[PDB]
Structures are given as C-alpha cells and as structure tokens.
Design an enzyme around this catalytic site. Structure first.
Site, mmCIF file in Angstrom:
data_model
loop_
_atom_site.group_PDB
_atom_site.id
_atom_site.type_symbol
_atom_site.label_atom_id
_atom_site.label_comp_id
_atom_site.label_asym_id
_atom_site.label_seq_id
_atom_site.Cartn_x
_atom_site.Cartn_y
_atom_site.Cartn_z
ATOM 1 N N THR B 45 0.830 -1.203 0.000
ATOM 2 C CA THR B 45 0.000 0.000 0.000
ATOM 3 C C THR B 45 0.862 1.250 0.000
ATOM 4 O OG1 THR B 45 -1.395 -1.306 1.493
ATOM 5 C CG2 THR B 45 -2.137 0.914 0.928
ATOM 6 N N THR B 46 1.895 1.263 0.841
ATOM 7 C CA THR B 46 2.787 2.407 0.966
ATOM 8 C C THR B 46 3.578 2.660 -0.313
ATOM 9 O OG1 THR B 46 2.930 1.815 3.314
ATOM 10 C CG2 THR B 46 4.564 3.422 2.510
ATOM 11 N N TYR B 109 -12.536 -3.452 -2.806
ATOM 12 C CA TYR B 109 -13.643 -2.926 -3.617
ATOM 13 C C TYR B 109 -14.766 -3.931 -3.880
ATOM 14 C CZ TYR B 109 -16.148 -0.437 -7.409
ATOM 15 O OH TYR B 109 -17.127 0.179 -8.185
ATOM 16 N N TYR B 135 -3.041 -10.271 4.467
ATOM 17 C CA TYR B 135 -2.964 -8.861 4.832
ATOM 18 C C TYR B 135 -4.376 -8.304 4.916
ATOM 19 C CZ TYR B 135 -1.866 -3.828 4.086
ATOM 20 O OH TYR B 135 -1.758 -2.463 4.102
ATOM 21 N N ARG B 140 -9.340 0.116 4.137
ATOM 22 C CA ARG B 140 -9.024 0.330 2.727
ATOM 23 C C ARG B 140 -9.776 -0.603 1.790
ATOM 24 N NH1 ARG B 140 -4.606 3.251 1.270
ATOM 25 N NH2 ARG B 140 -3.260 4.032 2.965
ATOM 26 N N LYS B 164 -0.616 -9.916 8.249
ATOM 27 C CA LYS B 164 -0.324 -8.535 8.576
ATOM 28 C C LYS B 164 -1.621 -7.821 8.986
ATOM 29 C CE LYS B 164 1.025 -4.095 6.438
ATOM 30 N NZ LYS B 164 1.108 -3.409 5.172
ATOM 31 N N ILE B 205 5.409 -4.706 9.636
ATOM 32 C CA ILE B 205 5.581 -4.193 8.278
ATOM 33 C C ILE B 205 5.227 -2.719 8.378
ATOM 34 C CG2 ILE B 205 4.646 -4.140 5.940
ATOM 35 C CD1 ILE B 205 4.344 -7.257 6.289
HETATM 36 MG MG LIG Z 1 -17.195 2.927 -12.311
HETATM 37 MG MG LIG Z 2 -0.391 -6.649 -1.308
#
Ligand SMILES: [Mg+2]
Ligand SMILES: [Mg+2]
Ligand SMILES: N[C@@H](CCCC[NH3+])C(=O)O
Ligand SMILES: N[C@@H](CCCC[NH3+])C(=O)O
Ligand SMILES: [Mg+2]
Ligand SMILES: [Mg+2]
Lengths: 296, 296
Positions: B45-46, B109, B135, B140, B164, B205
C-alpha cells in the site's frame, strides 16, 4: 449541461466457461430496453468491473453501445479506477467508441484526499466531451466524496453533471440538492430509490432492475412525474427483494436470482466472487416468488 | 512452515518525472539494510501498488531482490489484487524472480465473502512454493478476513504462515494467537507495534521505518528478545511521528517526510494521490524535528 437520467441498470456480466458470454450480454440488454429502462451501465460494480481485464471491459462497453443503437436507451459506461491514468484511459475509450456518458467510481483502496479526488475527476472530465457522473460508495472504496467536493466538481467542470450516491445517507442527499439544486442526484441504493427521487433526485442506477426492469422503470417514471403515491407503493413492494439482493455482497445475490429466473445459463462468477451459501440461495429463491419476473 | 518475520519496511516508491526512480529505489533499500531491517516489502500500500502498472510493479520487485542479494535481508513482495487471476500472476512472478515470499492484501472494492476469500488465497498459495502472508486492512479494502478464515487458511495451505493486521483491533490479535499460536501475526499499524509484539506477534511491516529504520528495527528486536521495557520505550517515543504519518492517507505523509529529510529528490505522487495540505505539511515537518533521522 448534457445529462443522462431516468431509470438505469447496473448490468450484470454473464460468464460461460470463464469468459464473458457476449451473446447473453446483448440479450440481457434489449430485455432492459424492452422493459422501459432509460440507460444501461456496462461494467460497474454490479458488472464485476474489478475482475474483468481491460480488454473485456472494453468489449462489454462496445456490446452495450451496439445494442442500444436505434433506441432512446443511453449507455453510461463504467470507467472507474483507483488510478487516474487508468480512469482517463477508460473515459477516452468510452467516448471514442460511442458511449453517451461515463460513470466513474471514487478511487478505491488508496483513499485519496478531497484534493486528490478533485484532481482525479478534473483530469477525467477534461479528457472527454461527454457527460460524467460521479459515483460515491464508501463502504466499497474506503473513501467519501464530500458534498463540498461534489459541488465544486459540478460547478467547475462543464461535463460533470451529478453523482450516483450509494451511502445510506439521506441527510447528505438533502445537503447536496439544497446547496446545488442543478445537479442530477442518482440513487445507487435500490431500497431508498423513492426517498431520493422524492427529494428531487432524477434517476436510479439499479441492481434490482436486472431482475425487475419494468417495476424499477415504473417507480422512477411515476416519481419523476410527482406521482409519489404510485412511486412509493412500488418502492414499498420492492423492499423485500431490494434487501435480499444484498444478503451477500452484490452481485452475488442478483446473479443468483437471474440464474434462478432462467435469465442466465450458469451461476458463474470470477474469483474472488463465488456462489452464495446454500441458506442464502434458498432465501433468494423464496423472496423471488413474490414478484412477477419478465422473461425475454 | 517457512516464514518471513522481524522488522520489515513497506517501501515507498519514489517517482522522478512521473516514472519510477530506480536508482533512488535501490539507494533507499540499501539504507534499510544498513539500519537493521530484516525484510523489505516492495509495492505494498505504501508503495502505491494501485497506481503502478503491472510492469513497474514487477520492476520494483526485481530491484528489491537484486539490492538485497548477498545480505541477510529478505524480500516479501507485494502481490495483492482484487482479481484472483491478477494476484496469482503477481505471486508466480515474485516466485520466478527470486522473492523470498509474498504479501497479499485482501481483495479490495468487490467485497468477497469469507468463502470467496478462502478460495482466493487458496488459489494464490497453490500457485507458488514460497511463504504467503495474508494482509487485512478493512478500512481500505471494505472487507475483513475473519479470524476463522485466517486460521483455516493457515491450517489448510502449507505456504500461508500468518497475517499482517492493520485493523486497530487488539481483541482480534488476542483471538488469533489464542486459538492458533503457531501463526506469525505481523503488525501493520505502527502506533501499536509494541502491543502486538508483546502479545506474541513476530514482526512489523512498517511505514515509519521508511524514515526511522533504526528505531523500528530496534523496537522489534527488543520485543522479540523479550525486553518489553525497552521495546515499549521506543514505541512510546515514536507515537507522535507514528500518528502524524497518517494525518492524511498513507503514503502522503511518509513521502512528505522523506522529501523533507532529503531522502528523496522530489515530492511526487501518482494521481489520485497528491501533496498534503500546507497545514499538514508544516505539522509533519514540526513532528520530525524531535527525531534523529539517519542519512545514507
Ligand atoms: Mg465505475
Ligand atoms: Mg499486497
Ligand atoms: N483489477 C484491476 C483491473 C480492472 C480492469 C478492468 N476494469 C482493478 O480493479 O483496477
Ligand atoms: N489499478 C489496478 C492495477 C494495479 C496493478 C499494479 N499493482 C489495481 O488497483 O488493481
Ligand atoms: Mg449511436
Ligand atoms: Mg536481522
């Protein structure tokens, strides 16, 4: 502004043997066209946008555009991404391949700030000359487009014409239309289609309409005419199916219902989506018995 | 099980003129190595995994592997996706190009069910023979891998060796290690590194370790050697920077700090990420002054 409003469907994407069933896709459109739907949204959340390839995403947009030629029905193409460069690419593709407008979900996973959301959507809107509908669904994306950011984007960008709200927040719906009544607020949550429309929302982008396009179409057109008694009665009658279609993550229940209704050949998802539990499969089947489902 | 534990850094991805700055990337990894870090995570992510292309993602993995070659420092490659077929592809690439293991974020999502998460990670784990770390970061992704699902995957899949956790949920951390004490619980939230380690977690992490690798590695190593007094002392000292590095969405504050420290050339993000507000820029700069930042 140029606008795309009315009763709209977030199309499921049918699979056969792990590939997009392109004949089924076209047949399911046309069924939407023939049952009073004003626009179709290929490859939104309900269309499994995250697991299609960029090539398949584009193929589905093309099928939707080809199937709607010669009709009033508009194509509001899904074009969202967590990456602005990818969202711009999809927007330009949709414009160059004849879509009437684009829907663009707030970037998911990477949680941009409001300033980043503004720059994201400004870059998308500047890349095409067709209408752009924002799409807020914080339960899926991990971020919110604030009312202030939506209003700034609507006022600053010629072709950004409104927002699809899927946030269970009628206060925000009031906030939006009280401060900027020129925007097109679009319901993204079927259970509250009527309350959003009765506050001056101008359409819906529906999951339930995949199964019951005639009922969602009638609800929307009653409400747009201020026939609120008739619109509310349909909204109330649809509540049970509207909620059971989310007993697991959309589009797992809606595809299950389409399969049970014989509208798609196989109950196939792309991983990580998969079939519902046996118990939920039976709950969906039970609730369906209370509704008249149009065939082809 | 083969495991990758200890103090690990979620590497930022520096950009120059909109492209990955590959020489800066290697230089920053060498700095991590010289300051006691046990493993590096390219393109988590970072590292702005969502806006890199698949080719840039692969290039960063290769730089990490090459820069770490001949050191004791391992490479735990970021390999997550909302699409199981993309996650499998990244896993196989990481295996083929010499990564020691992979990190794989829960699909974002599209909100898979627990059954879907099980099948997603089973497919990933079966595609390679190197360790796989789950993870969980529901703020998020919009989904949560349950304790039951994590433990089932740990027990059923030889390669899957821990998780994680970035969920602000020390109750879940107790749940996990009380029912399955053999797994490697890894802290994904810097401010609570010590509480997670003191309950038997076996590494971190870290975001903060990009800026202060010596302090985060010492914290972890004190804790693993059961010197909780000194581990907590560093955790306490770090609280102010650990929190300010999330005043806007990560990695916006950490890249700002790396730029302020002279460790990267330019404050460049990929849209929809962008620079922090002027007020938050000044607050990050102010907090940094209380810490001694290692150079190159
Ligand atoms: Mg769309
Ligand atoms: Mg990943
Ligand atoms: N899995 C990627 C690619 C999807 C491409 C098709 N819309 C994403 O969610 O962004
Ligand atoms: N934007 C897409 C593609 C990223 C590919 C590199 N990690 C996603 O979030 O899945
Ligand atoms: Mg035409
Ligand atoms: Mg070491």
């Amino acid at each position: 502004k140029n606008i795309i409003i009315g009763a709209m469907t977030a199309l499921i994407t049918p699979f056969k043997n792990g590939k997009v069933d392109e004949q089924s896709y076209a047949r399911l459109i046309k069924r939407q066209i023939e049952n009073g739907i004003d626009a179709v949204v290929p490859v939104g959340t309900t269309g499994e946008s995250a697991t299609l390839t960029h090539e398949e995403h584009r193929t589905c947009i093309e099928i939707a555009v080809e199937t709607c030629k010669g009709t009033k029905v508009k194509v509001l193409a899904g074009a969202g991404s967590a990456a602005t460069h990818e969202a711009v690419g999809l927007a330009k593709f949709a414009k160059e391949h004849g879509a009437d407008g684009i829907l663009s979900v707030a970037p998911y996973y990477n949680k941009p700030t409001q300033q980043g959301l503004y720059e994201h959507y400004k870059a998308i809107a500047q890349s095409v000359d067709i209408p752009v509908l924002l799409y807020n669904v914080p339960g899926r994306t991990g971020c919110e487009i604030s009312t202030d950011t939506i209003i700034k984007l609507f006022r600053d960008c010629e072709n950004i014409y409104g927002v699809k709200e899927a946030s269970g927040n009628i206060d925000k719906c009031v906030d939006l239309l009280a401060h900027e009544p020129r925007m097109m607020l679009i319901s993204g949550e079927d259970a509250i289609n009527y309350p959003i429309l009765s506050n001056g929302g101008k359409g819906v982008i529906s999951v339930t309409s995949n199964l019951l396009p005639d009922m969602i179409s009638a609800l929307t057109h009653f409400a747009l005419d201020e026939n609120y008694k008739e619109a509310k009665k349909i909204n109330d009658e649809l509540y049970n199916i509207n909620k059971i279609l989310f007993c697991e993550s959309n589009p797992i229940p809606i595809k299950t219902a389409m399969y049970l209704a014989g509208l798609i050949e196989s109950l196939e998802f792309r991983l990580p989506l998969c079939s519902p539990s046996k118990e939920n499969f039976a709950k969906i089947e039970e609730v369906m018995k209370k509704y008249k489902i149009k065939g082809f």
